[PDB]
Amino acid sequence: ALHVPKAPGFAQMLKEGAKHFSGLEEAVYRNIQACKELAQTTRTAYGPNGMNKMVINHLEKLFVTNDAATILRELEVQHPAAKMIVMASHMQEQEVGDGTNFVLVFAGALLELAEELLRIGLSVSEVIEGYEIACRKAHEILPNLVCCSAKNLRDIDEVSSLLRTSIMSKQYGNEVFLAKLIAQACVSIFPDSGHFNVDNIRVCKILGSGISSSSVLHGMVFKKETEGDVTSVKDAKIAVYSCPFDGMITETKGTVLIKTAEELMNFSKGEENLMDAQVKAIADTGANVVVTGGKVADMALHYANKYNIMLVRLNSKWDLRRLCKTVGATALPRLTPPVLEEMGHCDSVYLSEVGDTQVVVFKHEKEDGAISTIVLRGSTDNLMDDIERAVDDGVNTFKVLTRDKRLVPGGGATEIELAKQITSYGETCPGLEQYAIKKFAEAFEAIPRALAENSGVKANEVISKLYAVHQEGNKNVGLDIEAEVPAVKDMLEAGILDTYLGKYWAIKLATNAAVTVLRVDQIIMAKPAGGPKPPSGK
Amino acid sequence: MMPTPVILLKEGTDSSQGIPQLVSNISACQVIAEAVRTTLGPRGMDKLIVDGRGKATISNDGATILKLLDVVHPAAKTLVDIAKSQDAEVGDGTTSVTLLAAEFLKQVKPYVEEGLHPQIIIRAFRTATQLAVNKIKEIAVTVKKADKVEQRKLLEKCAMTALSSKLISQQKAFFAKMVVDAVMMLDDLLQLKMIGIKKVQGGALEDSQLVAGVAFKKTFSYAGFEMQPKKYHNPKIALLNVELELKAEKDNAEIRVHTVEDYQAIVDAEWNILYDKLEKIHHSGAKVVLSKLPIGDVATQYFADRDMFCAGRVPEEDLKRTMMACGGSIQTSVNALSADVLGRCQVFEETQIGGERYNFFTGCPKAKTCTFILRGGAEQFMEETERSLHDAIMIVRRAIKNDSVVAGGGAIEMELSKYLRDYSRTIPGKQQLLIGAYAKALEIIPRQLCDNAGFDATNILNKLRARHAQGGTWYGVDINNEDIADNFEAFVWEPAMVRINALTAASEAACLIVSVDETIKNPRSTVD
Amino acid sequence: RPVLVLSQNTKRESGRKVQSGNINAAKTIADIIRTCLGPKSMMKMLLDPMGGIVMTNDGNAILREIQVQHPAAKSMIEISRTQDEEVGDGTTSVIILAGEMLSVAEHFLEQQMHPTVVISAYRKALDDMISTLKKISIPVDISDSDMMLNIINSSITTKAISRWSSLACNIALDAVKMVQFEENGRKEIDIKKYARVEKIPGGIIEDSCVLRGVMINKDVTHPRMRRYIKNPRIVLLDSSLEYKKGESQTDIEITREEDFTRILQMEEEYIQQLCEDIIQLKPDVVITEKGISDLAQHYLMRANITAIRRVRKTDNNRIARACGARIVSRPEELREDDVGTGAGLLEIKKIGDEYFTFITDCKDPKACTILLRGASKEILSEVERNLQDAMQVCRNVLLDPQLVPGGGASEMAVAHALTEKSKAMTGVEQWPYRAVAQALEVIPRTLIQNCGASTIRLLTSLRAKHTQENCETWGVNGETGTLVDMKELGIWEPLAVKLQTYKTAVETAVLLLRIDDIVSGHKKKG
Ligand SMILES: Nc1ncnc2c1ncn2[C@@H]1O[C@H](COP(=O)(O)OP(=O)(O)O)[C@@H](O)[C@H]1O
Ligand SMILES: Nc1ncnc2c1ncn2[C@@H]1O[C@H](COP(=O)(O)OP(=O)(O)O)[C@@H](O)[C@H]1O
Ligand SMILES: Nc1ncnc2c1ncn2[C@@H]1O[C@H](COP(=O)(O)OP(=O)(O)O)[C@@H](O)[C@H]1O
Ligand SMILES: [Mg+2]
Ligand SMILES: [Mg+2]
Ligand SMILES: [Mg+2]
């Protein structure tokens, strides 16, 4: 009468380190609590007034940023439900590029209200059905909330205004300058063909002069020095070789078989003469710049210096391909002189020093080309990394705008209007699904509430004013962060807008993650293993 | 808290958030700034740091001291990073940046403790920094004459100002003249690799010399080297990248013979290959032979028999400097040793410097490179002399790029503080307090100078403030007379870029530190 | 070396984490015993650290038999103990109510509302709840035994003794009625001291009864005594009937030959004198809390007096109350008024393998014993706990003759009244007021959940019913999961119990909402 034995059946059959959780209280509420904890951890970084977080991973690498996806990447999340929500957020990041914090906040609010509904007496299936119906209703309503279209993408000022909002959430102090930079870089890219490639925007981070000194360059910048003595070319005729700048060798096996003294005396002289002839043949085509992906032989460098040819060595083949795209050249597999079609042209190639690092610049004078580069200055590596994340968000926003040109008001205006419309719809639906629909509508309040909380004002007053104005009939009125008291203003004139695809995909993924978390009824966790990572992830 | 049977994050994760976290960040930044406080000014002091290996490093340079410290506080590492940034972009001011950043954070700490929103502080810092940079650009003194004498004097004064805080401050005029002379002979890019720094133990500081040419240590001479003459009066120099040794023709080469006559022919062929290389070198008229690759004993004796000089295994950068000074070209092949690819110097000589043999290439009229030979009684002595000369070299290069100067000794910062206080007195009042805090924080450098000198910081600061308010822009701390003086008339000159970068970096660091509200530390993996 | 402005073993927590932890701990405490409420409650087995087993569904016992580490859980345990001591009923209800109120308060704490506003709203709601509960109360004629039995039955309908309802109700009513006492203008009940509950394992539960007297596990000192006396005259004592040493050191010095025998003979003569002084009153039974000498036993049997020794002081006080006697510490001062006449029978009979003394025919006794027979000691312990609940409810009704409807009717009526009052608040604290008002619905919700019916449909129907005018007596039928008029089912409960439950729950919510910092690890410094 002093110990409670394990119940016969599954409990006794379970392994040593394994864990089994079944039923509402033991599984679903625990999962909802974990998801709410994750959402609360990420919540404080939402919106322009979000606060950066110093996250140190297991490798003592410091990340300071307010990007939700990055924070979740660098956090050692252990709970399976939080892992599922993180997967949904990362899927949103991959599909669109922005809105991860929205996904996390919406999923957390949905799961909290789902717990509340289950407590009042609703079943999991009823909650899931109501959530799906409300998600369908929201997706139907969303196209009607579009306020304006991009209507142009080759302009500079207009696209900069479009991209300001996406990079106002991060780097709230100075977003106009970054918007102008990213707009110029993206407008250089994106030719008459409607296809826009994100990879074509390169970011080179050079330390020292503060981010206000950053610039956009039409070309590529490589942080290294030249192999030769020529360090500046004014009418570059770059020839790109994917082979080492050396005499080609047999792939099977090499062995110089010498049988007479004449061959021994003449071998090196003949090899030198052959390589000199090859280099002179390359130079005769007019190529004053040579780029190679392999090593450079000493005799090769000597004969290139003799004929005044600039040598640049690119170890990474991705950089070689990007340079070929930039200049318009073809990577020769051999060391043959290039024909006129394969010889790329760049209007200026030179060796330069920016701050401390030595750089080689392939600079075009036109405002065009396949690849454009943004050189970022700054006083800290972490600050430059955060600016790079903001640049990535802006570029992804531009890509989304190229895909779909429709926009919706930001600052919680769209969320408040969606909540109002879904509540109105659910007020008419009979049956137990109305509770789930109303809770789904209420879950949209977490966005303006989080914005107001981060801004430092009372959330309830802001939400009440938003409902009042929206009931009056103003669908473009949202939170005004430039005030010390709860206030709202029309945000079509303010230019604070969000991409339609971003909201659509964020809502879809958040609802899917919430319903998938709710569907789980039992958890059977195996004993944790200390393996050297799964082989899939290397 | 609750046990939470399945916990969210990995066990051992430490999280800190709220006002205490930011206050602790500010305190850590203060701790970091305290480690370099006494290194600022002519009355500054050096620091000695010993690593785990037992090797001690002695430095007055703020960036070096911060790098040596193994800082692990995430907020404190920002000060080290901005010091590195200031060293990279400018090269001077690595202590002022940290002092300014820590002073900004210290001044705004009371407002943080009251619950003021960090975004307001960040906006105030951004506004104050923009205004201060604009004021610096407005009031900086420049001369639009391009006079060579005036430009050289300005460069020398800037170098003296950059040098009057190090152990070589007693010979600051001598070293500043040397540094200006060295920099003025760089061609257009001012590459640092074109200025060689050689440290030879023994001798006084004044024994250090600048070679209008190139000099490097003797490199493992083989047998027969001592028969080579060690002085030439108009030598032609053959810069080569060639291994002058008896060796296998190629790594994969193989010789197959079936007759003793062919065996003798092969041996004589190897000897003839080497002798043909040597004869092609000799017929070029060159008297000094420098090679990047080894030169064997056979080649050494061959050159000694011809009254020639050889030096193999010369470091690549030394060969590059020799090419830039004498004016030849590094040849990987000796088949075409025309007069175009041969260097030329007035005098080549091998002398002894403190128990070491050095090869001197002097008399180069078209030299585009230099070589500092620094003499000192200790290894760390020479290292810190090199660091000081590097600071001076960066200052002189930046002054070459743009000849805009402001008075030092805290005069520029007192003027900026007065300007910012005057501006802040004309705004609503929420930003007024923060901009006034920024202006008060700019007064750290003159106060630190007075504290290091053993002065009365309060009285000097009061006199400086009154003088700036009642008229006078370049009035700063006079260390010698324990008073204030017109530092512009005292030739305490700094390039405007130094203070511009210092203010920009310090403001960025302060804004980054303030912008953080939560710190998360994941547990270490593979602690072992 | 390590400075440590504070001690190393001191750990401090502050902020939102402390509030969330406190509310979660209270919720967990409530969840432990949520399923032990209502007529369809399921019992639980508690394993004591000493090796014993407690099988019960009483909330206070379950929470008392649990050791916790979180101090909020300790506060909840103390709350349950306070509710048990003050009124004896409503422990599960008060725990559940405190948990629900703390949950709805955490709702607001997650937003930017200060806990002081929530506390003020809670106190206003507590005043309104008290007012409404007093309003919806009904009076009771205590002279009507049927109403008292019905009230007790409603009290014990949810316990394991409900299968024998009439028997337990009659036992509790008779015990409380006959232990009721009044003297010098002061009225008292004192169920704790008198109305002792004695359980003898074995027999059948139907044989349990309340005796018109007392029972002790004692036997006569000598086999020649009388084990059956018709109308005994009982004398109770504190002092031993044996020779004892004096307080002061009293060494004797014997030099004569006849002194030793004289000392022994005087010891015998002292015993004889004490026995003769006792006999002078002509009693039949002598009870002592201390030993009785064998020579004293002989002298008492010489006068045909039955003697019992080594009786507990509480038992002797209960005997004095039952037979109307007075304890006397000096036999030479024994008065006639001290002799206990009024006991109508004394019998020493053997139950099982032990002798028990019965004084069980007293006329107008002010003390009683409850003889419980059952399957085992755990069943009898649960029966004793249920009888304690019944007697506490009876005493509360006798002191306060007010009643309120049960079955969650009072909860819903008070919640509706507070919701109606809340629409005129027009302030910022109206939301916590309404939330804590509707938090009362957790009792009908728990009843419906335990019954197994649909919570949402029944709760909505009950709310709609309570929105009408004369529907404050509409609750939940705990057995069938149906809405019934509570005055038809007739499960009423004392107003004092409901008031205590509401007050204690709201005060617990106020106390736990007030704390945001926790520091632990410091020494006791006692
Ligand atoms: N100037 C502004 N005023 C008010 N709200 C804004 C402003 N700029 C952006 N927002 C809001 O901030 C939200 C973006 O939050 P963000 O930190 O970007 O999260 P995510 O990266 O997940 O989108 C958008 O929903 C937008 O409505
Ligand atoms: N002769 C001088 N008189 C007064 N102050 C000086 C003088 N020379 C340098 N300073 C001050 O010393 C400061 C720089 O100190 P130093 O340690 O040399 O460089 P760093 O800025 O890297 O600390 C400058 O702010 C300058 O005003
Ligand atoms: N027959 C019944 N039908 C419906 N409700 C009942 C019935 N009997 C009791 N109740 C309700 O059950 C509650 C008593 O539950 P109980 O287990 O005694 O909790 P506690 O021990 O905390 O008093 C009372 O509020 C009463 O309204
Ligand atoms: Mg975003
Ligand atoms: Mg300096
Ligand atoms: Mg009860």
Three-state secondary structure readout of B375-396: EECCHHHHHHHHHHHHHHHHHH
Residue of B nearest to C71 (CA): B1
If we measure between CA atoms, which residue out of B380, C461, B358 comes closest to residue B372? B358
Is there a contact between A83 and A92 (Cβ–Cβ < 8 Å)?
Answer: no
Task: Tell me the C-alpha distance between B410 and B443, whole Å.
Answer: 8
| Nearest-ligand number for the alpha carbon of A455 | 1
How many residues are listed for chain A in this entry? 538
Cβ <8 Å between A207 and B74: no
Is there a contact between B292 and B319 (Cβ–Cβ < 8 Å)?
Answer: yes
B8 touches chain C (CB under 8 A): no
Which residues neighbour ligand 4 (ion) by CB within 5 Å? A 98, 169
| Nearest-ligand number for the alpha carbon of A503 | 1
Cβ of residue C432 lying under 6 Å from some atom of ligand 3: no
Is there a contact between B170 and B204 (Cβ–Cβ < 8 Å)?
Answer: no
Cβ <8 Å between A458 and C112: yes
Helices H / strands E in chain B, number of each: 16, 21
Task: Tell me the C-alpha distance between A211 and A208, whole Å.
Answer: 9
Alpha helices in A142-205 (DSSP H): 157-164, 176-188
Q: Alpha carbon C517 to chain centroid distance? A: 36
Task: Tell me the C-alpha distance between B195 and B371, whole Å.
Answer: 6
The token pair that represents A281 in the structure block: 């043949």
Residue with tokens 């369908």: A136
Nearest CA to CA, how far is B485 from chain A (Å)?
32
Q: After which residues is chain C broken (C to N over 2.5 A)?
A: none
Cβ <8 Å between B1 and C13: yes
In a mutational test of the pocket of ligand 2, which residue from B85, B413, B417, B492 has the highest number of ligand atoms less than 8 Å from its CB? Answer: B492
Residue C407 marked as a ligand binder? yes
Residue C92 marked as a ligand binder? yes
3-state DSSP call for residue C5? coil
Give A86-94 contacts, CB < 8 A, sequence gap 24+. Answer: A86/A38, A87/A513, A88/A509, A88/A510, A88/A512, A88/A513, A89/A509, A91/A509, A92/A505, A92/A506, A92/A509, A93/A69
What is the sign, positive or negative, of the torsion defined by CA atoms of B3, B8, B11, B14?
negative
3-state DSSP call for residue C71? helix
Helix pair C409-422, C455-466: axis angle to 10 deg: 60
Residue with tokens 């804590």: C436
Is there a contact between A127 and A443 (Cβ–Cβ < 8 Å)?
Answer: no
3-state DSSP call for residue B52? coil
Residues of B in contact with A225 (CB under 8 A): none
What is the sign, positive or negative, of the torsion defined by CA atoms of B71, B76, B79, B82?
positive
Task: Tell me the C-alpha distance between A478 and A414, whole Å.
Answer: 8
Residue with tokens 């926009």: A407
Residue of C nearest to A2 (CA): C51
Q: How far is CA A409 from CA A107, A513, B27, in A?
A: 21, 25, 42
If we measure between CA atoms, which residue out of C163, C144, C143, C138 comes closest to residue C153? C163
Residues of B in contact with C22 (CB under 8 A): none
Give the other-Cβ count within 10 Å of A487's Cβ: 14
What is the sign, positive or negative, of the torsion defined by CA atoms of C312, C316, C319, C321?
negative
Task: Tell me the C-alpha distance between C158 and C36, whole Å.
Answer: 9
Residue of B nearest to C21 (CA): B1
Nearest CA to CA, how far is C90 from chain B (Å)?
28
Which residues neighbour ligand 5 (ion) by CB within 5 Å? B 92, 162
Q: Which amino acid is at A384?
A: M
Nearest CA to CA, how far is B395 from chain C (Å)?
45
Cited resolution, angstroms: 2.9
Task: Tell me the C-alpha distance between B526 and A6, whole Å.
Answer: 36
C456 touches chain A (CB under 8 A): yes
C389 catalytic residue (yes or no): yes
C50 touches chain A (CB under 8 A): no
How many residues are listed for chain B in this entry? 528
Task: Tell me the C-alpha distance between B325 and C361, whole Å.
Answer: 133
C459 touches chain A (CB under 8 A): yes
Is there a contact between C343 and C306 (Cβ–Cβ < 8 Å)?
Answer: no
Best mutation target, C456, C457, C460, to test chain A (most A CBs within 10 A): C456
Give the other-Cβ count within 10 Å of A136's Cβ: 11
Give A353-356 contacts, CB < 8 A, sequence gap 24+. Answer: A353/B189, A353/B191, A354/A206, A354/A208, A355/A206, A355/A207, A355/A208, A355/A209, A355/B88, A355/B89, A356/A207, A356/A208, A356/B88, A356/B89
Q: How far is CA B243 from CA A377, A433, B290, in A?
A: 44, 88, 11
Residue B451 marked as a ligand binder? no
- How far is ligand 5, taken at its centre, from the CA of residue B100, in Å? 15
C neighbour chains, 3+ CB pairs within 8 Å: A, B
Cβ of residue B59 lying under 6 Å from some atom of ligand 2: no
Active site members of B: 61, 94-95, 391
If we measure between CA atoms, which residue out of A308, A313, A314, A324 comes closest to residue A231? A308
Class of residue C461 by CB neighbours under 10 A (exposed 0-12, middle 13-18, buried 19+):
middle
Rg (CA), chain A: 30
A neighbour chains, 3+ CB pairs within 8 Å: B, C
Is there a contact between B2 and C25 (Cβ–Cβ < 8 Å)?
Answer: yes
Q: Alpha carbon A202 to chain centroid distance? A: 13
Task: Tell me the C-alpha distance between A348 and A337, whole Å.
Answer: 21
- How far is ligand 2, taken at its centre, from the CA of residue A503, in Å? 55
Is there a contact between A302 and A246 (Cβ–Cβ < 8 Å)?
Answer: no
- How far is ligand 6, taken at its centre, from the CA of residue C472, in Å? 21
Task: Tell me the C-alpha distance between A407 and A394, whole Å.
Answer: 15
Catalytic residue among C56, C91, C446, C504: C91
Residues of C in contact with A121 (CB under 8 A): 445, 454-456, 459
Cβ of residue B41 lying under 6 Å from some atom of ligand 2: yes
Cβ <8 Å between C51 and A459: no
3-state DSSP call for residue C3? coil
- How far is ligand 5, taken at its centre, from the CA of residue C251, in Å? 103
Residue of C nearest to A40 (CA): C110
How many CB pairs (< 8 A) connect A and B?
A: 199
B1 touches chain C (CB under 8 A): yes
Is there a contact between A468 and A481 (Cβ–Cβ < 8 Å)?
Answer: no
Task: Tell me the C-alpha distance between B89 and C9, whole Å.
Answer: 49
If we measure between CA atoms, which residue out of B211, B179, B188, B189 comes closest to residue B198? B211
3-state DSSP of A62-131: EEEECCHHHHHHHCCECCHHHHHHHHHHHHHHHHCCCCHHHHHHHHHHHHHHHHHHHHHCCCHHHHHHHH
Nearest CA to CA, how far is B319 from chain A (Å)?
13
Is there a contact between A448 and A467 (Cβ–Cβ < 8 Å)?
Answer: no
**CA–CA–CA angle C350, C356, C362 (5° rounding):** 120
E strand or H helix that includes residue B168: none
The token pair that represents A315 in the structure block: 């170890």
**Nearest atom of ligand 1 to the alpha carbon of A494:** 1
Task: Tell me the C-alpha distance between C124 and C331, whole Å.
Answer: 63
Residue of B nearest to C26 (CA): B2
Residue B296 marked as a ligand binder? no
Task: Tell me the C-alpha distance between B322 and C95, whole Å.
Answer: 91
Beta bridge partners of C404: C493
> How many Cα atoms within 13 Å fall on the side-chain side of residue B348?
25
Nearest CA to CA, how far is C31 from chain B (Å)?
15
- How far is ligand 4, taken at its centre, from the CA of residue B375, in Å? 59
